[PDB]
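Dear colleague,

Thank you for sharing your sequence with our group. We've completed the structure prediction you requested, and as agreed, I am returning the results in plain text so they can be pasted directly into your records. Please verify that the sequence below matches your submission; if there's any discrepancy, let me know and we will rerun it promptly.
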Amino acid sequence: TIQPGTGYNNGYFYSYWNDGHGGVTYTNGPGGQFSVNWSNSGEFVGGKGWQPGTKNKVINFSGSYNPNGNSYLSVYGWSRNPLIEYYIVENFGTYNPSTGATKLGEVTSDGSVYDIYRTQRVNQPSIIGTATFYQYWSVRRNHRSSGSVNTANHFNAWAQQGLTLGTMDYQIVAVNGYFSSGSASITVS
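Please find the predicted structure tokens below.
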């Protein structure tokens, strides 16, 4: 595993964070590749992409994603001003992260309908410190672990619905886990 943190590997920005509970390892491979292996983990997120992201990136990803419990595979990132955490969720494990959330529309992109949602985090950690901020979600109906994500289709649909993004911070293809097990090997470009 590598040490939790952020940096660059083979031209790609990466972020790997965990809560210190144990049970997760993350490695950076050649090009845009990363692997995650976890067994009775705590909370974590890791992946590769860009810092800063853009609002018209076409993100390609390919590989394998085998969660056993609560985990997502997504295009994941933040904006500033307004502070927003967002996810374009391509696959997940036992928990659909939109459960109970307010649905804000639908968008069709890259071979599937996605359902759009908005949630709120209250006094939670963020890229700028503890804060209250909205989260935006596009959740793919047709789950997959390879493909292409035309991010503009999502960001434009969000904007149409009143879900505004500020200036982009990082933008990665990420595996999230919350107290679960699994394995994944993903290559980004």
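Summary note from our side: The chain has one domain: 1-189.

Kind regards,
the structure core
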